């Protein structure tokens, strides 16, 4: 029961999707192959959550890998754990999007979302209880960001009480990757303001510093990257597969997140993450895990706290621990930190303990955040979608797949209503 | 001949059952499943079948399926009855709407299938044991919906009920206000006695006089699992001076809607420090009477006393007893309501406290536990309601709970009632 | 019956305190422990338990846990309760402000709560005995702190104190002048009697009467601990001759702010050079009220004598100090206050003093402990005056002082008390 | 509890830092490389005071490492003892103070002194009951004049209520080891006057002497100055780490040593200093250890007692003694020699006694001395600045990192204001 169905969508969510399914294949003890070959009888029971079962003891992921073109699934599968995925989950098309939402979602992926929701279907009506479903993209490229969306309505439309939670890249302030990001982006957040429960949104900027400052990473290939991705992934699904103290579904997080229905934008985190040479200098206890958790230099988006206030948080901690520590230590930050937490919420911390850690580690904890402070974020895109709409930079490629210019102020207005909600609800009572 | 029916629901609940039923097992000689190697003491509890079989009486409930499901897998998988542990498709996301409208709807009608199975077993029934969480989900919503059923099918059995109180400062949760108000709401007219706990009071007597500095939920379970098996010790075992179910109801419900009663167990010690104490009946008895040693982090000298039951057990005399309590009627300090001179019920019961083994309490003679109802209270509950005002002012979480079944005029309805409760609280602090 | 609550404050009275209990524990035939192997003497001072664990009835408290933190592992470790050994955070840094105002605040509601769980399990209560040190910090601030909620919760309970006075030329602390009036002006309205030794004074009866020419503290305590035994042996054992504790307040204090009697212990005498003395009554009777043998350097024919407890302990003839106190009268050199024609308090016991081993004291058969009332100490007084007024002068280190709660008025209204204490000095020497 | 941070600045800091911390760890009984070896247990039990506790007995100093430029750094974990610190406490810049006070003080250090209080602040919340600073620096330079003086005020701003204590060389009379000793000094004192509650003043030139008489040393290293000046660092904590008869805390010290707020510079000693072929010749007792540390030439300061008065005098003893030698030889001293101390305090000598001696000695003993005497060594600065600063010696350095001329005058009116002082508490009563 309370089965989750992954769906992957562009070249960045299959990459980390690829390396999400081999950090939950890790945990869960199943082989490369399929079989299961784990020691403890606990990542056994609550398996069906994210695999179903076939003869000879083969576990089969419950994931859809979509593309519109063929490169980025055909070397998932040719690398690690690319042949436990079932074949006919490989939905993809021969011409890909140029990096443009209107040719994803209107042109492109049209023709094949029918085909994707083939399988989405099939594998949502072989849950014994359906919990939500699990998308992984980017906000900057077009298929994520176009085709994506598109499956996000579809599955709204198809399943609307299931919660829907999604794990998108979100562009960088300080550099790019592709010159249409504020377009993409813009009409992509249009669709996720309306058809998502949570959405986590990372930047990889972030996480270059992460590996800069704290792992002290000199060589960071995407790959180290989409591990921290993958960790914060796990986390929020802990409660669900293994038992623990205090337990935390996908919806008891939502519900404690989300005040309103629009503001469930969250900037994750994890802990602990130190260098190889500094680790025989940290005692590796409560009270220095939540002292890094609320740092902004830890956390996987650029958007810093500090400038905003927090809605509210939630910090969901694995192995065996003094709960004890964890209310006081959650306490202590609030306390100190009155200033940083939105005042008409008496309580802005929700707690959940799994008593089953990674692999490797004694400890850990996921940070989810929903701050104010997150309107840098859409503002920013803001500025850079205007500047280009200003004087249409680039709209005849847009326009030419049969978007219409009505379209591009629709998604401005409803980014601008989403930024000044979050600066309303930022100030206190009357 | 006597019996009763322990229903616990949600997390909070099922994990202090274990605690309770952990211990009520090795009270009673039993071996971790129905069997007792080669007696009308057990019979309370536990029903009997011919093979040697003790079966709790009780009914585990949970709309998510992980802590049952722990059970199943637990070193006390062979006790209970299968059917007496229910599970649900999903939890209810700490939502009251989830756990009384929309998914409680779908197991309530197969929990009081098994309590119909259970009452017409039992020689004569003596009332409910209810554990549950005030802080949300299935523990405000569920409890709500099985405390009116049975008070319905049952009427006049009497209907305990343990739980979890908010605390003032520690919380998990972030909408603890809207489900505890909403609990309280619709188990005012249902309930006849609710004993409160917090979990940061026993996180500081777990440090302050148990010399541990970390605590997990498993120990504030035993220590609550000691005050239950205290408050039943009178069915289990004889004693000088017994006290039934049926008697807290009168004992500590001067009206019919303040019947919060607090809770304390006084000789929580460690083993160590137990070697330098006489732990002797006067010393014990005004330890409970001691903002320190309070279960609920509401200190009694903000209020009036207006009713409080010692129960006693061990080796204690009667003479101690009365003496023990005339001088703290004679202290200023511990002021009772004028219109209660008589304000002391005692229970004393042969039956000592036995340690959990692996536990941290020390092997005492003797253990009174206190159930003390105050006025003090309504400052508790005062707070509760201040935070429910702040987020229901911006309508902070109202979405989730009225897309699910229920209304806005419950928000209204049901903090009226809570402002009509503090009032009361007002009234029956004064006097002429 | 009776009984006796020992407070030790600072270092010097809990490093006293080591002595006294391992003195007491030797007496009373205890094992370092509360176990006794296989009696209404002990009771005094020791509180008993089931388990044959006897417990001191003695309070261990300083704002710095160095020194408490030792016997917590010393020899003594699980002699104590452990609630009793009260350790705080810092220390008073030798400062009177810090150890009354600033962190005695945060410490003082605690001791005082294990007073109040010591005094109610008394059958009977007859008084407190204080030991702290007058040079200052928590032995200055933190005493005035608790003696006068002392004198409030407990009231016309007796409270006897002894402190470690500051010698005249010795001294090992630049503000002890500060420090010293400043108790001095806060305690003499709520001490009973004061019980004065200087480090000094020891040093050298260690050295003239010892043959040690190497004192340390521990051969200064033990010296200390002897008196202490002396003063409570009528309560501890029997005698000829009984003398409470309630006794000496009435017979040493003759006006209420002058109640600071000397100490003296005669036979003072190494192992050695017993072999060649006699020890009789009248001549160890005769060597306290020499100036070479007083434990506090004052010396007696500087001023007159206005009251005088002669406690003999062992093989003491009840007529040898009938003569013995008769010839001393005699005595023109010995002069005695004219209004005070009686002027001598006997208490006989049968009990020995016995001997620390590992000591310097040899194994007398008979010890006396005079505990005299002397205008001469006005002297002292005079001289720590003087030093105050020199700093004072100055403004020496009063920032310090104000800097943590003190204020200035209070050096001025400390001075002017002690003012009028040297002049009813001068009032009670002088007759028509 | 009792927690001490200790915070280096510049070459001269790190230098005797890393050798305090080799002595520190030699009485503890902690290897180079963190692990515990030491045989008795009272070393353990008050560890925490400079060290943290981490995984497999590994104990970290608690000191932070801080200098403009990479090298001095760098050295120090190459040295011995040099891998025991924490990684992260190593914050560094690049461009290094040109030994001139403002540079490291408003140009250089100002944007560095940011991320050094980032780990203060966390070496100081991790600390059960703080009790201060322990800084060790130099006055000729610029790091640690300029750098060092910032960071005092910094923290003083910070923490209003714990006890600050500095350990800083000063410029020698005889000769110099830079051209703008002069700048540097007047400048640093300035702050400190005001922002600290005890510093140590130590001159080079005074511990060369001492070698030279005392331990007739031949070949004198930096490290061998250094150790005398551990020395007497570790001397003055000695009854916060081991128990004693007569403890004597850091603020038990400044109340005692410290009677006007600004009269607050000490001048240490250390004993016994013998030479190797003269150890044969001593007895090793109470009566000649206090005979030769309140002699002129065992005291690592430049200023003779003999020309002004003591106000106060500390002896911290170490090792087991007779309290009755201790106390008739410091009155003894104060008989002999009471021409020599203030009038106006009737005692003029603090003692303290600890139980455990340091590493190879039977008994120790460390001098603490505030005397009237101290003025010299400023009246000889300022001489030395009025010269320079009488015609533009140098300012245009300064005053081209930001000074002003008026910052000069005011540095040099305050040291004036202290030498006055000084010389108006040296007259009796009246
Ligand atoms: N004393 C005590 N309280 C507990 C324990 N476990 C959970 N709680 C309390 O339960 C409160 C929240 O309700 P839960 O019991 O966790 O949730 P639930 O009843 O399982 O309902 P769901 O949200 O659907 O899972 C928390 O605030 C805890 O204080 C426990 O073992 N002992
Ligand atoms: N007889 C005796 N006197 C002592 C002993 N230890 C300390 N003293 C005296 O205590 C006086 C100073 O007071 P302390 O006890 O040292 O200080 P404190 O009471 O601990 O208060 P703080 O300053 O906060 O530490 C000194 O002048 C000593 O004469 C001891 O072991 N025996
Ligand atoms: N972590 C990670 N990020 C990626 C990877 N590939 C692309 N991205 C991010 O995705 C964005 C580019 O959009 P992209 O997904 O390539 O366009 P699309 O193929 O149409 O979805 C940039 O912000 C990249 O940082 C990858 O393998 N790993
Ligand atoms: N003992 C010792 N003293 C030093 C060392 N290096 C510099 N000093 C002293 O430091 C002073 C010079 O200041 P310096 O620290 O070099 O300038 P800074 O780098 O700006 O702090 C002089 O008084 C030197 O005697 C060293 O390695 N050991
Ligand atoms: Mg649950
Ligand atoms: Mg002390």
Redesign the interface.
């Known amino acids: 029961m309370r089965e989750i169905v992954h769906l992957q969508a562009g070249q960045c969510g299959n990459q980390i999707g690829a390396k999400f399914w081999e950090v939950i294949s890790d945990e869960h003890g199943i082989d490369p192959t399929g079989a299961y070959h784990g020691d403890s009888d606990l990542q056994l029971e609550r398996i069906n959550v994210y695999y179903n079962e076939a003869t000879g003891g083969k576990y089969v992921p419950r994931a859809v890998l979509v593309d519109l073109e063929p490169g980025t699934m055909d070397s998932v599968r040719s690398g690690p754990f690319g042949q436990i995925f079932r074949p006919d989950n490989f939905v993809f098309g021969q011409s890909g999007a140029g990096n443009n939402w209107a040719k994803g979602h209107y042109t492109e992926g049209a023709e094949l979302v029918d085909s994707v929701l083939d399988v989405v279907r099939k594998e949502a009506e072989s849950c014994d209880c359906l919990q939500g479903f699990q998308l992984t993209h980017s906000l900057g490229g077009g298929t994520g960001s176009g085709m994506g969306t598109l499956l996000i309505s579809k599955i709204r439309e198809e399943y609307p009480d299931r919660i829907m939670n999604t794990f998108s890249v979100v562009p960088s302030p300080k550099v790019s990757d592709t010159v249409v990001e504020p377009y993409n982006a813009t009409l992509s957040v249009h669709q996720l303001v309306e058809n998502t429960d949570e959405t986590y949104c990372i930047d990889n900027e972030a996480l270059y510093d992460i590996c800069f400052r704290t792992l002290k990473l000199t060589t960071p290939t995407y790959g180290d990257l989409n591990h921290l991705v993958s960790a914060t992934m796990s986390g929020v699904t802990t409660c669900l597969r293994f038992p623990g103290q205090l337990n935390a579904d996908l919806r008891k997080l939502a519900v404690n997140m989300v005040p309103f229905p629009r503001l469930h934008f969250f900037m994750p985190g994890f802990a602990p993450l130190t260098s190889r040479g500094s680790q025989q200098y940290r005692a590796l206890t409560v009270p220095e895990l939540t002292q890094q958790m609320f740092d902004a230099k830890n956390m996987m988006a650029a958007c810093d706290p500090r400038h905003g206030r927090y809605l509210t948080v939630a910090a969901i901690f694995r192995g065996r621990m003094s709960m004890k520590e964890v209310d006081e230590q959650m306490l202590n930050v609030q306390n100190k930190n009155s200033s940083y937490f939105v005042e008409w919420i008496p309580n802005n911390v929700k707690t959940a303990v799994c008593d089953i850690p990674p692999r490797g580690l004694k400890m850990s904890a996921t940070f989810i955040g929903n701050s104010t402070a997150i309107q840098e974020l859409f503002k920013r895109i803001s500025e850079q979608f205007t500047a280009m709409f200003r004087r249409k930079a680039f709209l005849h490629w847009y326009t030419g797949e049969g978007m219409d210019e009505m379209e591009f102020t629709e998604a401005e207005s409803n980014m601008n209503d989403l930024v000044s909600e979050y600066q309303q609800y930022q100030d206190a009572t009357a | 001949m006597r019996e009763c029916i322990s229903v616990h629901i949600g997390?909070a609940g099922v994990?202090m059952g274990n605690a309770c039923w952990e211990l009520y097992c090795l009270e009673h000689g039993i071996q971790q499943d129905g069997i007792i190697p080669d007696d009308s003491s057990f019979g309370t509890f536990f029903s009997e079948t011919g093979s040697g079989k003790h079966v709790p009486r009780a009914v585990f409930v949970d709309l998510?399926?992980?802590?049952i499901?722990?059970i199943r897998?637990g070193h006390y998988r062979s006790l209970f009855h299968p059917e007496q542990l229910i599970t649900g498709?999903?939890?209810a996301?700490?939502?009251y709407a989830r756990g009384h409208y929309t998914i409680g709807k779908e197991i309530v009608d197969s929990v009081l299938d098994r309590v119909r199975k259970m009452a017409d077993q039992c020689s004569g029934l003596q009332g409910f044991l209810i554990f549950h969480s005030f802080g949300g989900?299935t523990g405000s919503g569920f409890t709500s919906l099985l405390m009116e059923r049975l008070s319905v099918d049952y009427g006049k059995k009497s209907k305990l009920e343990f739980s979890v109180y908010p605390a003032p400062?520690?919380?998990?949760?972030?909408?603890?206000?809207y489900n505890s108000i909403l609990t309280t709401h619709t188990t005012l007219e249902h309930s006849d006695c609710a004993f409160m706990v917090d979990?940061?009071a026993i996180?500081d007597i777990?440090?302050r006089n148990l010399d541990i500095?970390?605590?997990?939920?498993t120990n504030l379970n035993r220590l609550i699992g000691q005050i239950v098996s205290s408050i039943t010790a009178s069915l289990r075992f004889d004693g000088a001076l017994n006290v039934d179910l049926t008697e807290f109801q009168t004992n500590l419900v001067p009206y019919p809607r303040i019947h919060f009663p607090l809770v304390t167990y006084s000789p929580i010690i460690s083993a160590?420090?137990a070697?330098?104490?006489?732990l002797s009946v006067?010393?014990i008895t005004?330890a409970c009477f001691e903002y320190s040693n309070q279960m609920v982090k509401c200190d009694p000298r903000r209020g009036k006393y207006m009713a409080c039951c010692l129960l006693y057990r061990g080796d204690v005399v009667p003479k101690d007893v009365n003496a023990a309590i005339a001088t703290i009627k004679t202290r200023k300090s511990i002021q009772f309501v004028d219109w209660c001179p008589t304000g002391f019920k005692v229970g004393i019961n042969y039956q000592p406290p036995t340690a959990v083994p692996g536990g941290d309490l020390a092997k005492v003679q003797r253990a009174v536990c206190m159930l003390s109802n105050t006025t003090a209270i309504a400052e508790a509950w005062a707070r509760l309601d201040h935070?429910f005002d702040?987020?229901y002012?911006?309508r902070?979480?109202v979405?989730?709970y009225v897309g699910e079944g229920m209304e806005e005029g419950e928000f209204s309805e049901a903090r009226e009632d809570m402002a009509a409760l503090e009032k009361d609280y007002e009234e029956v602090g004064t006097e002429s």
């Open positions: 997390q994990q998510e399926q992980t802590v499901g722990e897998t498709k999903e939890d996301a700490n939502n989900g400062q520690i919380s998990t949760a972030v909408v603890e206000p979990n940061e996180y777990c440090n500095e970390r605590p997990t939920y160590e420090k070697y330098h104490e006489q006067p010393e005004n935070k702040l987020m002012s911006k902070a979480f979405h989730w």
